[PDB]
Structures are given as structure tokens and as C-alpha cells.
Amino acid sequence: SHMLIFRQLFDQQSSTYTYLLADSTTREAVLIDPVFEQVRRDAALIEELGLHLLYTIDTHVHADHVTGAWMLNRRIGSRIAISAASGAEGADRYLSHGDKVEFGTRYLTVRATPGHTDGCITLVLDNETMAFTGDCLLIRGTGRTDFQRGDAHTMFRAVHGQIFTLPTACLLYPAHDYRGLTVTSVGEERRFNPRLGGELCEEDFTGYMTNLHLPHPKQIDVAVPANLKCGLAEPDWAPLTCSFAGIWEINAQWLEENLRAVEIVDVREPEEFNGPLGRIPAARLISLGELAGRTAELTKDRPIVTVSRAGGRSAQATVMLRQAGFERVANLPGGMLRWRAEGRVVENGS
Ligand SMILES: N[C@@H](CCC(=O)N[C@@H](CS)C(=O)NCC(=O)O)C(=O)O
Ligand SMILES: [Cl-]
Ligand SMILES: [Fe+3]
């Protein structure tokens, strides 16, 4: 009913595109092809957008990366969805041709598009302005057809029957690109795809694919068994969360209840430290511009929380401390301003 929230995310290691969709009317969301290494990033992004993740959806059983479907299920309670035809065990919902994956007022429709694997699906947005083609159709290309259940004939018929029948202007988002491309469309691939577009026939395409010899994915021996189980098999010195920017944040309530358990490093200027906002009791003053050169005064025996006026300069303090070998470091988000606004203890205030 209202605007669609859409985010394309890239995993540099496997060149995988993850896709986040959500209805802004209800903030309910789905996530297509989440990457295991990217679980903290993806979950942080969902949190910062105020979203509720109903489903992870895997287009097929991947050979190049372990999916995040299980880790996200465990951590934020999202449901695992994958095709029935893929044969993976441990999912909450098996998908078949014509299934409708709802999120709020919006939905995706499932189209079976095997060829790369016999479980590949393509997800079509309700208004058919975009679709997610997994490794079936790629940007000016296709998925490989040469391992296990791969079949070039099946892929050709899938692309022509299920994808080239979408609207001409419909955008197509693939699970991978290796040249820095992000999207294509039905019209472009139908006309310019060099393997099965234009006037190429089924025989032309299969002859191409039977002579395409690509190295196996680097993670193949690890990923496919892991993904047949939907991705089955973390600082704990304080309750920590990692922001989308990548900064480790401490829970302020826990910090006030355990100030003796940590070293508190105030990176403000000397005037701010003795100034009207006050300081957190027992806070060590090492101004940010002095911090890098004085890291030998802090002990690795005890974790370190950085504080500044509003949490900005202290976030940068965490990066400097990590680059100097410190591991148990965290930022106090919102800084002295939020500490005071939440009525927490300060010395020398006003
Ligand atoms: N070198 C890549 C593997 C490249 C590859 O084979 N990607 C697959 C996706 S599972 C494909 O089907 N086609 C690649 C292409 O057509 O260039 C990696 O280690 O991840
Ligand atoms: Cl600040
Ligand atoms: Fe694949």
C-alpha cells in the first residue's frame, strides 16, 4: 500500500547479492539469499530500519557461500524458506511454483526456474516491476549447468517460459555478478543475452554451455553440505550489539550496573571532561588526539568502553584501539548526552 523498502547488498567474498524487501506500511520484511558471514550486518540493517524479518528465502542450494538462513533464524526468529524441489532439510516453509510469500500488503510469487540446480526458483514482485532470478539468469549470462542436477535444456526452457514471459521493463536481480553490474531487465536479456537471447535456439545454448569450463567455487566442499541443512553449524564480556556501520556498542544499563567491571576511557577535550556535562565516575581521560600515542597505559586484562559527547568521537576511538591490538572494546552510543538524559550517574555535572 505504501512505499517498498528495497536494499541490494553484496558479499565481496562470494560476489553474492542479498536482497532485503519490506512493506513500509507494516515494516514486515523478507531477505533473499542471505550470506552467513554477513549475518551481523544484515541483522543490524534490519534493526536500524525498524523492520521485522518474516522470512529468509534461498533461491537454490548454493555452492559458493553458506546461507545465513539458520543463523538468522536462531538470532532474530526469521523463518527459513527454500524450494521443495531443492531437497534441503530444516526449513520452516517449502516453496513450490505459484506459491505467494506475503509480507504486509506486498508479496512475491514463486516461479520454478531449474537448470542451474533442480531446485532453483525465481521470485517475482507482486507488481512485476522486478524479479529475483537466483543463478538461473545472470546479467548478460546464465548460471553454470555443469554440476550435479544441472541441465542446460531445462535452463533454456525455464528462462524462456518463466522469465522472458515477464513484462519487458521488468528488472532482473541475480544472485551473483562478477563485473560490478547490479541489474538487468527482461528486454535486454531477451535481445542481448549472448547464450540464449536473440534468435539462439535450445541447441545453440546447450552447445555453448557444454563448452564453458569454469573453476568450481572456492567454498564448494563446505557450502553445499551446509546448505543441504539450511546453513547449520560473538563477544560475551558485556551485552553487546554491532551497528550497521560496524561499531560495537555496549548496553548502557549493564554498564551502569557494572562500572567497576570495565575501564572507561573519556576521549573528549580536557575542557569537556571538566565541563558542564560532567563525566562518568572513574573515567580515564585520554583525549582522542592523544589516544593513539598513549595506548600503552591501557591494560588488555580488562575490556574498554569509550565515551565522548554524543558517541561519535568515541566510536572512532574503538577503531583506533582495535587497530592497536585491543579486542574487548565497545562504544557507549549516544555519549554523555544520552547518559544524562537517561538519568544515569555523573560526577561534576551541572
Ligand atoms: N570463482 C567463483 C565461482 C564462479 C561461479 O562458478 N559462479 C556460479 C554461481 S554458483 C555460476 O553459476 N556461473 C558463473 C558464470 O557464469 O560466470 C567463486 O569461488 O565463488
Ligand atoms: Cl562525540
Ligand atoms: Fe549457484
In order of their start, the domains of the chain are: 1-235 (3.60.15.10), 236-350 (3.40.250.10)
Q: Give the C-alpha separation, 151 to 336, whole Å.
A: 61
What single-letter DSSP state applies at residue 176? B
Q: Which three cell numbers stand for residue 169?
A: 521493463
The Cβ-side half-sphere exposure at 165, using a 13 Å CA radius, reads 11
Closest listed ligand to the CA of 177: 1
Shortest-distance Cα residue to atom 18 of ligand 1: 217
Chain centre distance of CA 98: 27
Dihedral sign for Cα 222, 223, 226, 231, please.
positive
Of the listed ligands, the closest to the CA of 227 is 3
Distance CA(48)–CA(276), nearest Å, equals 31
One-letter identity of residue 294? R
How far, in Å, from the CA of 266 to the mean position of ligand 2?
Answer: 10
Instruction: Match 532474530 to its residue by C-alpha cell.
Output: 76
Would you say 61 and 143 are in contact if contact means Cβ atoms under 8 Å apart?
Answer: no
Whether 63 is in the pocket of ligand 1, judged by its Cβ within 6 Å, is: yes
Residue with cell 523498502: 5
Q: Helix, strand, or coil here: 205? A: helix
Chain Cα centroid distance, residue 285: 37
Whether ligand 1 lies within 6 angstroms of the CB of 300 is answered as no
Q: What's the CA dihedral at 227, 233, 235, 236 to 10 degrees?
A: 140
Nine-digit cell string for 62: 548454493
Taking the C-alpha atoms of residue 51 and residue 67, their distance in angstroms, rounded to an integer, is 20
Residue 294 falls in which region: left (phi positive, over 0), alpha (psi -120 to 50) or beta? alpha
Q: Which of 16, 149, 214 to mutate to test the pocket of ligand 1 (most atoms within 8 A of CB)?
A: 214
Check pocket membership of 190 for ligand 1, CB cut-off 6 A: no
In angstroms and rounded to an integer, the radius of gyration of the C-alpha atoms of the chain is 25
Q: At what angle do helices 39-48 and 69-76 cross, to 10 degrees?
A: 50
Residue 294, C-alpha cell as written in the block: 598513549
Residue 110 Cα to ligand 3 midpoint, Å, equals 17
Q: Of 194, 191, 205, which Cα lies nearest the Cα of 115?
A: 205
* 55 annotated as a binding-site residue: no
**Degrees (nearest 5) of the Cα angle 5, 11, 14?**
140
Cell 570495565 locates to 262
Closest CA to 57 of 22, 87, 90, 93: 93
> Considering only CA atoms, which residue is closest to atom 5 of ligand 1?
217
